Write the structure tokens for this entry.
Amino acid sequence: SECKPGATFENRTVDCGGVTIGTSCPNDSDKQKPLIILKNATVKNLRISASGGADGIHCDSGNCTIENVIWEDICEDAATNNGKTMTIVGGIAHNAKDGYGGKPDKVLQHNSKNSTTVVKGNFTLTGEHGKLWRSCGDCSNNGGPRFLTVTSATVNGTIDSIAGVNRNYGDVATISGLKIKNYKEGKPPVCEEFKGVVKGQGSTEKYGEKWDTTNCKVSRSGVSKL
Ligand SMILES: [Ca+2]
Ligand SMILES: [Zn+2]
Ligand SMILES: [Zn+2]
């Protein structure tokens, strides 16, 4: 029940005691493995070093919870939903321009279907970021629906956008309680609608930011300046 790179937790909750772990982060996806793999489990109070974020934490089965986890410099992505439910409870996720893993991209990667990623407990983003959550746009065996639930989160820094939903797959992002540093309408965009596709069967299309639509369930009242 120790927290170290390569660890897989299943049917239990693990308290890492606030320890720091990590491997490396070359700028290569061919070689970045997840630090922790979760299977109907929970991981808490864990720090991941700046030069060793690798491929983050994977929720490869069932319901998962990632509580009070700190990413000193997100490498490929922070956490990945390949299960039924992935809940992010608090924690801080830092990333930066000129950091490890290249230009900042996605924090939460969501690939499973008829699943839900949940962001609560005031999960915070620091530094420079790409997107908080993205429903895989061109995955192999892509489809939906994919759901995002944000009841509270803080972006103490910069970010390209918040959520990306695949309109043609029935994805729904429900956002509220979001605070963004220097927020202004469209700066940055919150919920954006896209057209998802199956890998090799076509290409993705961008529809842009939307408010209070079937797929983008966020009101202008749900996002505010930090
Ligand atoms: Ca990074
Ligand atoms: Zn990844
Ligand atoms: Zn995995």
